[PDB]
């Protein structure tokens, strides 16, 4: 059964190597969540540092692709960094050729088309990663676009990725049924981060210290990650309500 | 490495046959029957469309009979997509020859080159051969009216009347039985249709399931690709419907 070793069709019309690449996604046992505010897009990811010898500042699955685009990865760090370096290269080249900052959704489509090639060409293996791209686009506003090893991509009101993805998804689904809108009706990004963290706690049923979380925030004309002290200030606000 | 997944499409069997050529010919044997009949004053090409659907657009359809230049046509049996690659190559080779010598390409030269391309795929490159058999109907000022066939092996031969695709055994016996050398085009038209009518796997032969063409002659050669209504008429006139 060499139809399970390379990206060719099985008799039932499946690509097993693509399906197994999806299973590699959850190898890190990390859950990510992305939501949109009025003016911002917030992405939160669990931060697990099991080894005591590790330098925790270097353990990250959130990447600053460009000045406006942020990318969180669910999957092994080698494939994550492979995708990150390529996305950084693609965003820079776009700006040089076309004279404007590469949009979140166009970078997503580009990285998805690269992923698609790995599912059709045999010599290249798929990357075992799901890429969640966030920005505040100058045309579309707050944007979430997610890529997977099948070369599939789509836009999201909000999204979740990881082992306990379904639990976070239904939690957010239920909120948007109630609120009757496509975003978190909140002025400041600080309170959109507080919402993201609150709903992850409710979905996973676990509490978080300042070192258990990793936060990325997209505003107009910059994407930035929060320090441990920025998160800690945010966790205090939640607790005092 | 990649050696593991190589089918080795260009190797001999212990019996000294080319596996992929033999299996390509098996493929072609399931294709709709194509008959060429060469008369003293023209050539007939008749081909059976593969199990037609009622909602198929019959009038603006080309499956079996293709024009190579003003003096040469081919009937196809096998993968249509493979045939079209080869047909465009042949159309270009014909215009290259006309550009070079200011003379319409002699039929055999075009046939030999197209056959030599097929041969190449069986001896080198490690690709699957073209799953196509052609009947070439053409005229030149040297040999006059000529019928050839080529198959995936790249072998070509000349014929007075020939069939390719499904039920060639049965079709060749019927042609061998009723064919004679002093035959007219109108007689050859009747033979071609009668032969398809008896060899067909369909309940009854109808205009909508047929493609038809004649290369006839006050000193010029005319190619007539028959319209649906013109097939309907010739099918009533010969008394098959």
């Amino acid at each position: 059964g060499y139809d399970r070793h390379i990206t060719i069709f099985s008799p039932e019309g499946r690509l097993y190597q693509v399906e197994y690449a999806f299973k590699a996604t959850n190898q890190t046992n990390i859950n990510s969540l992305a939501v949109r505010g009025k003016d911002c897009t917030v992405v939160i990811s669990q931060k697990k540092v099991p080894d005591k010898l590790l330098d925790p500042t270097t353990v990250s699955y959130i990447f600053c692709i460009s000045r406006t685009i942020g990318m969180v990865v669910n999957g092994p760090i080698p494939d994550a960094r492979n995708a990150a370096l390529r996305a950084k290269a693609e965003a820079a080249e776009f700006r040089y050729k076309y004279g404007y900052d590469m949009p979140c959704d166009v970078l997503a489509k580009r990285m998805a088309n690269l992923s698609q090639i790995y599912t059709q060409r045999a010599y290249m293996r798929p990357l075992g990663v799901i890429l969640t791209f966030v920005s505040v686009d100058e045309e579309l506003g707050p944007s979430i676009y997610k890529t997977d090893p099948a070369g599939y991509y789509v836009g999201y009101k909000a999204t979740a990725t990881g082992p306990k993805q379904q639990e976070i998804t239904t939690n957010l689904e239920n909120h948007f049924k109630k609120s009757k809108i496509d975003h978190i009706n909140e002025e400041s990004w600080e309170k959109v981060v507080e919402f993201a963290i609150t709903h992850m706690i409710d979905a996973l049923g676990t509490e978080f210290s300042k070192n258990d979380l990793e936060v990325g925030v997209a505003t107009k004309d910059k994407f930035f990650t929060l320090s441990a002290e920025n998160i800690e200030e945010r966790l205090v606000a939640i607790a005092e309500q | 490495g990649s050696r593991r997944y190589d089918s080795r499409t260009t190797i001999f069997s212990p019996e000294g046959r080319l596996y992929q050529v033999e299996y390509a010919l098996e493929s072609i044997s399931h294709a709709g029957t194509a008959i060429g009949i060469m008369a003293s004053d023209g050539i007939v090409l008749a081909a059976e469309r593969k199990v037609t659907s009622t909602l198929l657009e019959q009038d603006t359809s080309t499956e079996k009979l293709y024009k190579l230049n003003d003096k040469i046509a081919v009937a196809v049996a096998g993968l249509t997509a493979d045939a079209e690659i080869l047909i465009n190559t042949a159309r270009i080779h014909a215009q290259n020859y006309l550009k070079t010598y200011n003379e319409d390409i002699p039929v055999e030269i075009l046939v030999r080159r197209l056959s030599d391309i097929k041969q190449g795929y069986t001896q080198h490159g490690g690709l699957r051969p073209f799953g196509v058999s052609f009947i070439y109907a053409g005229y030149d000022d040297r040999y006059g009216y000529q019928l050839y066939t080529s198959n995936p092996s790249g072998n070509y031969t000349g014929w007075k009347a020939i069939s390719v695709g499904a039920n060639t055994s049965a079709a060749q016996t019927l042609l061998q039985m009723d064919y004679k050398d002093d035959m007219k085009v109108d007689d050859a038209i009747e033979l071609a249709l009668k032969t398809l009518s008896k060899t067909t796997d369909s309940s009854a032969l109808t205009y909508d399931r047929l493609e038809f063409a004649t290369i006839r002659k006050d000193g010029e050669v005319y190619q007539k690709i028959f319209k649906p209504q013109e097939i309907k008429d010739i099918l009533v006139k010969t008394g098959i419907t």
């Binding site: 069709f9 599912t119 | 044997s29």
Partner: protein
């Protein structure tokens, strides 16, 4: 290093079957239903928008794609394979036609170029076939309105009306009963929505259905005035509202 796979991954089996093409068609069968109907004064192409998640924004994923101002495409099968085929189709409409003849290719010739790309994935080294069937609807001055199906093999056939994917067998039977040569465009849209309701199980509205037409020229969509010969694109994607209006009188 380097692509060592310079040999065909699609080969003839002893039975004469091309396994990878057969298996690609199996993937298309599992695919969501899409259909095309040709009227006298236009063509309609339609498909269900199977939403992966309700959090997903189904507007962003476009299953019906403009190839040229007068040519549109829908698919059944693997969405990513379709997306890269649309990109290659748009580019080849320019590189191998528009940049030579200064006009957009006729439906049959663009279909021919798409078919060629899909045939190459069937024979070239180190690649699998495309796991999609395309329905391409188009208009051109000398051929008028036309509808073509393109298969993983690279084979294409012109249709009066057809369907591909999940419920194509049942959908094709339904179209055979309803289709005549005197259909106006509005009649073909009506039939398309009736046909597609059979194959859709869940919600059936303008947000779960994607539908485009090749019809009259749209001066309003051209984006400039002053050139009388330039009258605008014949391809128009129907809005969520325009679909819901035709579902009331159903």
């Amino acid at each position: 290093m380097t692509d060592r796979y310079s040999f065909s991954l699609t080969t003839f089996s002893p039975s004469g079957k091309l396994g990878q093409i057969d298996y690609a068609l199996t993937a298309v069968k599992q695919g969501v239903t899409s259909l095309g109907i040709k009227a006298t004064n236009g063509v309609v192409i339609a498909t269900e928008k199977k939403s992966s998640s309700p959090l997903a924004m189904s507007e962003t994923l476009s299953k019906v794609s403009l190839l040229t101002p007068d040519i549109g495409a829908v698919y059944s099968g693997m969405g990513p394979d379709y997306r890269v085929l649309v990109d290659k189709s748009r580019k080849v409409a320019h590189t191998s036609y528009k940049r030579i003849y200064g006009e957009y290719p006729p439906t049959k010739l663009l279909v021919s170029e798409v078919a060629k790309i899909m045939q190459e994935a069937t024979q070239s080294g180190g690649v699998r076939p495309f796991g999609v069937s395309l329905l391409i609807a188009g208009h051109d001055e000398f051929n008028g309105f036309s509808l073509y199906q393109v298969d993983p093999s690279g084979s294409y056939f012109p249709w009066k009306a057809t369907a591909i994917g999940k419920g194509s067998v049942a959908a094709k039977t339904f179209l055979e009963k309803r289709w005549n040569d005197e259909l106006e465009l509005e009649d073909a849209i009506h039939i398309a929505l009736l046909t597609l309701k059979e194959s859709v199980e869940g919600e059936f509205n303008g947000d779960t259905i994607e539908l485009a037409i090749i019809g009259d020229e749209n001066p309003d969509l051209l984006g400039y005035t002053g050139i009388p010969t330039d009258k605008g694109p014949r391809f128009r994607k129907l809005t969520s509202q325009e679909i819901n209006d035709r579902l009331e009188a159903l």
